[PDB]
């Protein structure tokens, strides 16, 4: 630590997870509009039509930034409010709001951190096969030019693609996320077609103005194994591939890991110039962290031979996630030594737990002492040389969490759905501590 | 200095000599009402009826400390406003000034600290005997548990006395403070019984929640002779027992410092258990620092053979106080290698001197100089590895002096008694640019 | 990097080249007036009439530094606003202007620091040999006087003149500057008054109190050549001899430099007493920094056988001024080892470039660049153990440059001048990001 060292801290959100008026404005519908009305797909029969209303509300939200002290706010565009038909005319009502949230942020001293994708893709573009068509990749670059267009006479640091892991295997693998397709190849075409539109979008932003950053949102879940048998090592092995270096690798190294493209037994859908694009040089890593998985081998397992195991004893939080703030230190020096980035943005990491509201208040320990032990485990990793240079906090408020519903709250702020009032949990003053006192 | 590191500035005030409305809002008197109704206890006639209004201009004193930019607020809860009769029932327009405060601190973006014991026994329970009384100590914990289950929703750290020198001695052997008892036994008596109480009432704030901290507030009086004699060495060693050891012994070490016990040669009244409650382990040690004494051996002074020595030649306070600066850097040093604190948190610190308004405005050079040569030993001790996680200014305002009356004047921010107006002064100006620019 | 230590960020700004009111409130002319009214010396016909109307709006600027963050705001007190005259009585309504100023950034949380001189000498003394007449340097120092006795028991930290360079050789042998003299003779002679008026006032400022820090703030122009002959060496010694040691040497070896003395071949007006006098000891340097000059031997040149060179090949901003930050270290670590004050302050540094007003806002990657770099730059210095205690930017708002007019805009918040509004640049983002960061 030594002068003229800096440190970001702030809040994350998305777009479909807090905005509303999913049906107003000119948005039109998204592939999460669409599979959270199909019957089983999500908790409670839940949706994203009001979720926190932020579209409306969202001077409030940014008023909660600043009280907070934040100085950056890490937030998603929804590339359906902005281009309904995905490939053609902007809607000049969505931009619009996109341009009084990031004016009202600036005035307040916040610097807005833009996602480009986290998960809303147009469902206009579903219908001609979403990101298992190759034109997806270039459809989103050329959203994305048009954002950067517009926006980056403010906005300086941009986020191209969210999680990738999850709309690729689990949107189009395990169908449990939108759009809910259940087919390997298609995963695999997804994978790729997620990371092109990633690598076209970087070069667009670049044509743009050279002094825009750029880089990608890759969520990470290291393994471990109970077992000591060699096949459990293995699963291991094919765990971490299969979350974790088949988007790392891509970005960072230019190559698909040939372990897991041999398990798999496809082909990767890669045309000349794909990889070189794919690995174009980011200015960070946006890295998401929330736990540790636990697996053994199952030769009778799809694609791949290995099994989630539910270890005992383990603290776990709402989620049934399980809580070990070491792994995130760990993980912050594997990264750092594996793949190398120029430097680390924490753009997630946060938990969830059963909040309750007694005399108009949320007191929430259990989430306060997960944030506490994971920046300590962030700042243990810093301390040792990783250029980890901010720590944005998931969430800000509660919100839409998926296919679980409004029922699993990442909040900071609490919101009451029937009123959409705020409260700020203990959490909250907790990290406006942090911020100030660091 | 390293990531993650963090600390936290504050200022300091106490309930009776600030709050006022000492025959108002359904709060009973303590012992500092009766005290300073006698002629001669207490300079000029000056008593806590009105003090700094606080009671009322809570949220002006609130704005000011979120003008001077502190983390953090050290304040106390009046025993006899919530509970007049010591024990029993709440008195509800008691609790809620403080929910009060709490809120608006909160708002602000202010962590209120709260101390449970500032000297303002409940006369109810001084009718019963005081903290010569042994049930005092258990009075005290239910008093301080039911406190801790009504705000530790909000306020998660925790003091439990603050000065019992001051309480004990002051109070119960040279009669200077409140209740003004002059007798050994009983300064010996009440002592235990406030280490007692301490001890409880950390364990049951305990026991309301595992997540909230506690300590207990100490001041030290560092000694020194002049003298070169054997005997002169034996004058510091009493003169740190009495002020220092007697009470950092119990709470640090689980015992009397003996060579103190040998010399008074009385019967301190400890049943079974006592020490094993008085040194339960705390989360930090509050510590109070203002000046060092000067002593000389006296074979016919009481209860120990020393006395008091004006050093000649040295710079002085207001209230004839020396002030050396590098007393507090090595104070803080033998703390923290005698006792381990796991940290240590200023909890006073400051100085009084005549001050002058002139064109409504308050130049106060002198302390201003004390406090830059204070917060620089501080910080030298820090960089040596002391844990020092905050400091807190005595005081936000000018106050009630206990036997000095208003005269004293310790603030950063002048009050003007006729009008209750505040004016920060000059040290209000240099507090606010240390907080941020450190 | 220790714990205790600190930093100041601040904004610069001079009376003349922001206030503007230049005929009201009971100003009287400064030389610059006069200047600005001579065909040819001024670009376009710029004068300060009008200016920013800081005099009105300052209320506005002050806030734009409170939301900026800045904990220090570093201006000039216009002499002939407060004494028009030059010496004799006080114009009240201008030292109640500056009374308003200063109330309003203590209310704010930001410490003023004034600068004395800062080139706006009253035409009242210039009538009577101005910086020539050794009575000036008098003059100037009972004027310092009365100012801090106004306004010392609020301002702590003092800077006499700003710039000697400018005023004694741009102002009377090159006569590109007020009062437009060309003769070398007149030169030294201002020289060496307004570095002995420098000695006054920081002793006469000292006699009001002995709290009261003063310094000085000298430009630097580091000095290279291109060549390598022993005539080109000797012209950079020339060089920083006639734009650095002349006045540094002065100040901090109580000498003229005896090269550029034997150079002129004439004679500084020395009288016994005077250097003791300038190089009475002072508790910072201001140091302004913005470009290193690039030279070569010229024999034909006057008064010392060099010329500029205009380097091919090398980043210039829009004063044609070459961007080199490492020689911004560089210089700070000249400095400490040549001069050794015992505390730095950057009271100005900073860049021009053309702005355009787009869609309401101004982005100007530009001045982001070099501002970014020459922090960069002055903490590398700082973690090398230069004693950089604070970076004071020029300027807040754009301004009036001097004879280049309201062309050259150094602010970090746009100025139009034809409605005075005041529009945050990219780079005023950038700061408010840095201050709050670092």
């Known amino acids: 630590k030594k002068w003229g060292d800096m440190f970001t801290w702030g809040v994350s959100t998305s777009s479909y997870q807090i905005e509303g008026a999913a049906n107003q404005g000119g948005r039109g519908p998204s592939i999460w509009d669409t599979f ?23 001077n409030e939200d940014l008023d909660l930034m600043k009280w907070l002290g934040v100085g950056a706010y890490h937030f998603s565009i929804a590339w359906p409010r902005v281009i309904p038909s995905g490939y053609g005319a902007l809607n000049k009502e969505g931009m619009d709001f996109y341009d009084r949230l990031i004016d009202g942020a600036l005035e307040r001293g916040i610097t807005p951190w833009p996602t480009l994708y986290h998960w809303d893709l147009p469902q206009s573009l579903q219908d001609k096969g979403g990101w298992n068509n190759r034109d997806c990749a270039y459809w989103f670059a050329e959203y994305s030019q048009k954002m950067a267009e517009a926006f980056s006479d403010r906005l300086k640091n941009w986020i191209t693609i969210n999680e990738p892991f999850c709309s690729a295997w689990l949107g189009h693998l395990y169908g449990v996320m939108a759009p809910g397709i259940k087919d390997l190849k298609t995963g695999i075409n ?23 950053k ?7 879940t ?35 890991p040939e372990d897991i493209v041999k398990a798999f037994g496809k082909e990767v859908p890669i045309h000349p110039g794909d990889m070189e694009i794919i690995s174009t040089p980011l200015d960070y890593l946006g890295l998401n962290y929330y736990f540790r998985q636990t697996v053994e081998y199952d030769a009778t397992a799809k694609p791949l031979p290995y099994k989630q195991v539910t270890a005992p004893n383990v603290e776990r939080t709402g989620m049934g996630w399980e809580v070990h703030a070491q792994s995130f230190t760990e993980l912050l020096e ?7 980035p120029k430097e680390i943005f924490i753009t997630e990491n946060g938990s ?23 920046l300590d485990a962030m700042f243990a990793a810093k301390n040792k040389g990783v250029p980890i240079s901010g720590y944005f906090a998931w969430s800000l408020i509660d919100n839409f969490e998926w296919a679980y519903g409004y029922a699993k709250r990442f909040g900071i702020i609490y ?23 660091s």
Chains 1, 2, 3 share one sequence.
């Open 415 to 437: 919101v009451d759905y029937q009123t959409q009032k705020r409260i700020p949990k203990s959490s909250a003053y907790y990290y406006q501590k942090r911020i100030k006192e």
């Open 334 to 340: 594997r990264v750092s030594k594996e793949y190398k």
């Open 352 to 374: 969830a737990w059963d909040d309750e509201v007694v005399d108009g208040k949320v007191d929430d320990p259990n989430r306060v002492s997960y944030l506490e032990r994971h």
């Open 214 to 220: 750029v880089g990608i949102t890759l969520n990470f």
């Open 222 to 256: 290291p393994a471990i194994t109970l077992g000591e048998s060699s096949e459990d090592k293995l699963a291991v092995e094919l765990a971490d591939g299969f979350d974790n270096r088949w988007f790392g690798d891509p970005v960072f190294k230019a190559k698909y």
């Open 36 to 58: 959270s009305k199909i019957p089983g797909a999500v908790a409670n029969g839940d949706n994203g039509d009001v979720a926190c209303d932020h579209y409306h509300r969202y």
């Open 190 to 212: 997804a994978s790729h077609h997620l990371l092109l539109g990633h690598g076209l979008a970087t070069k667009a932003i670049r044509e743009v103005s050279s002094e825009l």
